[PDB]
Each structure stands twice: as C-alpha cells, then as structure tokens.
C-alpha cells in the first residue's frame, strides 16, 4: 500500500514526479518521496524504513543482500556571491585564507557512514542548515562559501547571482540507486526498472 523512496538532498525530488500517476494506476500504492542528508539516507535503508535510496556513493550502509546501480554523474562546484571577498583573493584555497571566511554545511544523521563535504576545515566560522534551500539562500545572501550541485545553481551563475570560486576544486559524484534484495514487491520492482529511465543521458 505504501512505498517510500529516499532522495538525498543533492538529488532533485521533482525528478521522480512522472512516476506518481503511473504508480497509482500500477498499484494502490501511496508514495512517499522523502529527503535525507548524507548518512541519513543509508540509515533509513538499514532500518528498513525506505524501499529505495537515491543518494551519492557514501562508503557504508553495508547490510544483508543490498543491490545498487549507477544513475548519473553530478558536478559539485564551490560557489559564493559575486561580491564575496574570496573572489578578490589571490590564493582562495590556501589554508590561511579559507579560515577567514565562513563555511556553510548541511546537517545529517550521527555519521555511521564516513563522509564529509570536504569543504570546511576546523577553527573556521560555520553556518549549519538542514535543507539545500536554506544553504542556497545563505550563499545568495553572501553569508559564506560552500559546495553546490551545479544544476541547481547553473541559472544563478548565468545571471551573476553566484560565482564559482575556483574550478579546480570542482568534483564529480556518482548518484546511485540502492535497495535490499530480501523483499522485492510489485511496486518496488516496478520503480527499480523505471527510475533509471528518468536519467537516460544524465
């Protein structure tokens, strides 16, 4: 009756919207598309509270009978407001410089899945937010410097609301679909074959 899909914060939830009407005709399933951050997504899969997870490769979640499949590559870019002082700096990535300016991070579950944004060191000003929306607005308001998935800020860079601080730092991340094998129902199986079709060419 109920399927839960977990789309990690980096993954746009509305990309999964086409499924909804199809899923309602396919089964009497009430859908939940739930957002989690980093380790939270895999914690949900371990605790049997999430049927399918769409999340970056994050080192753990290792359980009994867990399968995966790669969907697409996502580009993360270090960004900041155009008139943020970091842009006038000669060596923005120098440890001496980075500590001066405030990092922006998104909260997650109590680890269990060893990864960091690798965007902020210690003894350095930090703002923590729960959602990518808060993070984008904080960046737009010139309140700090942080990574962002390129698609969500492509328009912002185009119209000069944000500016990439240094392209060398930009990194690529695999977005993967994972699930557990021990239970494999009609709706869950159907989605497992349908979700990759959403990102053919991504």
Ligand X SMILES: Cc1cc(O)ccc1O
Decide: is 13 part of the binding site for Na ion (CB under 5 A): yes
Judged by CB under 6 A, which of 19, 45, 132, 191 binds ligand X? 132
Please, which residue, 81 or 132, has the CB nearer to ligand X? 132
Judged by CB under 5 A, which of 35, 97, 109, 170 binds Na ion? 35
Decide: is 195 part of the binding site for ligand X (CB under 6 A): no
Q: Report helix angle 132-140 to 150-158, nearest 10.
A: 20
Of 84-92, 106-114, 126-134, 156-164: span binding Na ion (CB under 5 A): 126-134
Judged by CB under 6 A, which of 152, 164, 176, 192 binds ligand X? 152
Q: Show contacts with ligand X in window 16-45 (CB under 6 A).
A: 37-38
Please, which residue, 93 or 184, has the CB nearer to ligand X? 93
Give the separation between CA 135 and CA 97, rounded to whole angstroms. Answer: 21
Q: Could you say which of ligand X, Na ion, a copy of itself, none residue 10 binds, taking C-beta under 5 to 8 angstroms by partner kind? A: ligand X
Query: Is there a contact between 141 and 72 (Cβ–Cβ < 8 Å)?
Result: no
Q: Show contacts with ligand X in window 97-116 (CB under 6 A).
A: 106
Angle at 74 between CA 67 and CA 175, to 5 degrees: 10
Closest contact distance (angstroms) between CB of 106 and a copy of itself is 10
Please, which residue, 35 or 124, has the CB nearer to Na ion? 35
């Amino acid at each position: 009756t109920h399927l839960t899909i977990v789309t990690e914060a980096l993954v746009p939830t509305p990309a999964f919207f086409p499924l909804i009407d199809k899923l309602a005709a396919k089964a009497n399933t009430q859908l939940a598309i739930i957002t989690e951050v980093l380790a939270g997504a895999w914690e949900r899969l371990e605790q049997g509270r999430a049927d399918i997870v769409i999340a970056p490769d994050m080192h753990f979640r290792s359980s009994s009978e867990i399968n995966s499949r790669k969907l697409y590559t996502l580009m993360n870019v270090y960004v900041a407001a155009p008139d943020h002082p970091i842009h006038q700096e000669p060596e923005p990535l120098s440890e001496v410089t980075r500590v001066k300016y405030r990092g922006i991070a998104v909260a997650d579950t109590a680890r269990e899945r060893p990864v960091l944004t690798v965007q902020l060191l210690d003894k350095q000003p930090r703002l923590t937010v729960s959602t990518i929306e808060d993070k984008r607005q904080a960046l737009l308001a010139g309140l700090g410097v942080a990574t962002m998935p390129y698609p969500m800020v492509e328009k912002d860079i185009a119209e000069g609301r944000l500016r990439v601080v240094s392209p060398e730092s930009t990194s690529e991340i695999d977005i993967i679909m994972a699930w557990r094998r021990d239970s494999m129902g009609e709706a869950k199986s159907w989605c497992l074959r349908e979700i990759p079709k959403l990102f053919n060419g991504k």
